[PDB]
């Protein structure tokens, strides 16, 4: 059944066999899904025979603690299954030197540039939205949310629109393959593409994140090039799939809740609260560490080399954290969530993402406060690492839309 065998040192009272690939729940919605590990007969921390093997912690307390103690658990290997290349910075990287890379990559995604962006941002997010309007259709994932981050990219990294098409095909086939290139062609293809720009902006730079990036220091001297291709990789890959994926649950509700949409359309001053209680509810990155050494951990024996998945999902879904934690309700005095992350790798770009966020919500329910989801459509979601939502056919009436 792809049950890796039981390791010795893991009792059997903590075996579930959760599959973050595959879910049983999965048609009742991807965070539905994942919920199951929090229903009461399920321990805090358990294994799952699942994809090579390894730990879930399940609540909010355990999946912040581990998150904060990067000496026992490390991002050197993030991902499950364990045999799944990746040289991005600074997510492989533990402190002290993750730290160099992150006040680097501060300086291209930090709160100010992102206050500098944020017209730029709706400028294309109204152009994007604009162009769709009179059709009274689209499918949300495929005609808004993916151009939409990429765009934002080529704004910051200032890159020419025509090379849109070939560096979303090369991201695309990261995520999900089509089979013509592997994950390291996609990613040398990448560097093939960054590599010159990075040269040249050494030379005579902008004040574009590839310029900011590649004329940096880290420990005391210049970045290498390597360096320097490795992070700009991350800069791109990162602000996609989950900005594509998260825009699409929270359009899936929004056009599912005439109710949340009207309370916005009413009160566009909850915007910017709402836009945290949906990153609350509609949640969906999963990633991990690798123990560094044996560790006991809430009565629990871990052992060097261990991999253990702290989703990042779950810590808002928890309802030790939040109340009624499926019901959305855009004024919780309290949204407590680790939909960013939490400790010495908290998402960068989760300033850039808020606003990304805010700017959609804003723009699309002044310029189309009315959708539905495509009659006849049943939405289905995917979970991984990322969680997201397949397609998204909307439809609305153009004569009840607003040119702006
Ligand atoms: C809904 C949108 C987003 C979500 C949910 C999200 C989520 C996350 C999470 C959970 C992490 C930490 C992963 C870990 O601890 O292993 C992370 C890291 C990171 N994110 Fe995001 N992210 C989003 C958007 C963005 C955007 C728009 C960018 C900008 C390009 C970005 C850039 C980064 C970078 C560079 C890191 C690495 C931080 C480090 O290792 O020090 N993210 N993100």
Same mark, same amino acid.
């Given at each position: 059944?792809?049950?890796?065998?039981?390791?010795?040192?893991?009792?059997?009272?903590?075996?579930?066999?959760?599959?973050?690939?595959?879910?049983?729940?999965?048609?009742?919605?991807?965070?539905?899904?994942?919920?199951?590990?929090?229903?009461?007969?399920?321990?805090?921390?358990?294994?799952?025979?699942?994809?090579?093997?390894?730990?879930?912690?399940?609540?909010?307390?355990?999946?912040?603690?581990?998150?904060?103690?990067?000496?026992?658990?490390?991002?050197?290997?993030?991902?499950?299954?364990?045999?799944?290349?990746?040289?991005?910075?600074?997510?492989?990287?533990?402190?002290?030197?993750?730290?160099?890379?992150?006040?680097?990559?501060?300086?291209?995604?930090?709160?100010?540039?992102?206050?500098?962006?944020?017209?730029?941002?709706?400028?294309?997010?109204?152009?994007?939205?604009?162009?769709?309007?009179?059709?009274?259709?689209?499918?949300?994932?495929?005609?808004?949310?993916?151009?939409?981050?990429?765009?934002?990219?080529?704004?910051?990294?200032?890159?020419?629109?025509?090379?849109?098409?070939?560096?979303?095909?090369?991201?695309?086939?990261?995520?999900?393959?089509?089979?013509?290139?592997?994950?390291?062609?996609?990613?040398?293809?990448?560097?093939?593409?960054?590599?010159?720009?990075?040269?040249?902006?050494?030379?005579?730079?902008?004040?574009?994140?590839?310029?900011?990036?590649?004329?940096?220091?880290?420990?005391?001297?210049?970045?290498?090039?390597?360096?320097?291709?490795?992070?700009?990789?991350?800069?791109?890959?990162?602000?996609?799939?989950?900005?594509?994926?998260?825009?699409?649950?929270?359009?899936?509700?929004?056009?599912?809740?005439?109710?949340?949409?009207?309370?916005?359309?009413?009160?566009?001053?909850?915007?910017?609260?709402?836009?945290?209680?949906?990153?609350?509810? *509609? %949640?969906?990155?999963?990633?991990?560490? +690798?123990?560094?050494?044996?560790?006991?951990?809430? /009565? =629990? #024996?871990?052992?060097?080399?261990?991999?253990?998945?702290?989703?990042?999902?779950?810590?808002?879904?928890?309802?030790?954290?939040?109340?009624?934690?499926?019901?959305?309700?855009?004024?919780?005095?309290?949204?407590?969530?680790?939909?960013?992350?939490?400790?010495?790798?908290?998402?960068?770009?989760?300033?850039?993402?808020?606003?990304?966020?805010?700017?959609?919500?804003?723009?699309?329910?002044?310029?189309?406060?009315? *959708? %539905?989801?495509?009659?006849?459509?049943? +939405?289905?979601?995917?979970?991984?690492?990322?969680? /997201? =939502? #397949?397609?998204?056919?909307?439809?609305?009436?153009?004569?009840?839309?607003?040119?702006?």
């Amino acid at each position: 059944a792809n049950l890796a065998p039981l390791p010795p040192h893991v009792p059997e009272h903590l075996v579930f066999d959760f599959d973050m690939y595959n879910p049983s729940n999965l048609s009742a919605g991807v965070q539905e899904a994942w919920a199951v590990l929090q229903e009461s007969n399920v321990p805090d921390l358990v294994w799952t025979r699942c994809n090579g093997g390894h730990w879930i912690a399940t609540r909010g307390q355990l999946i912040r603690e581990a998150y904060e103690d990067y000496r026992h658990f490390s991002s050197e290997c993030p991902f499950i299954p364990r045999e799944a290349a990746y040289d991005f910075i600074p997510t492989s990287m533990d402190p002290p030197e993750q730290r160099q890379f992150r006040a680097l990559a501060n300086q291209v995604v930090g709160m100010p540039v992102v206050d500098k962006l944020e017209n730029r941002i709706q400028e294309l997010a109204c152009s994007l939205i604009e162009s769709l309007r009179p059709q009274g259709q689209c499918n949300f994932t495929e005609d808004y949310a993916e151009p939409f981050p990429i765009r934002i990219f080529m704004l910051l990294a200032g890159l020419p629109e025509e090379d849109i098409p070939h560096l979303k095909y090369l991201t695309d086939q990261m995520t999900r393959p089509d089979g013509s290139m592997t994950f390291a062609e996609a990613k040398e293809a990448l560097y093939d593409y960054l590599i010159p720009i990075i040269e040249q902006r050494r030379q005579k730079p902008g004040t574009d994140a590839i310029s900011i990036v590649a004329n940096g220091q880290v420990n005391g001297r210049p970045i290498t090039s390597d360096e320097a291709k490795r992070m700009c990789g991350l800069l791109l890959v990162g602000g996609l799939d989950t900005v594509v994926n998260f825009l699409s649950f929270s359009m899936e509700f929004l056009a599912k809740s005439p109710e949340h949409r009207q309370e916005l359309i009413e009160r566009p001053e909850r915007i910017p609260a709402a836009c945290e209680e949906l990153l609350r509810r *509609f %949640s969906l990155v999963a990633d991990g560490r +690798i123990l560094t050494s044996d560790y006991e951990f809430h /009565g =629990v #024996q871990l052992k060097k080399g261990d991999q253990i998945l702290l989703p990042q999902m779950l810590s808002g879904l928890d309802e030790r954290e939040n109340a009624a934690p499926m019901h959305v309700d855009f004024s919780r005095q309290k949204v407590s969530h680790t939909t960013f992350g939490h400790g010495s790798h908290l998402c960068l770009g989760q300033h850039l993402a808020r606003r990304e966020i805010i700017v959609t919500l804003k723009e699309w329910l002044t310029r189309i406060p009315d *959708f %539905s989801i495509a009659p006849g459509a049943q +939405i289905q979601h995917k979970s991984g690492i990322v969680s /997201g =939502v #397949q397609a998204l056919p909307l439809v609305w009436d153009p004569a009840t839309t607003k040119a702006v």
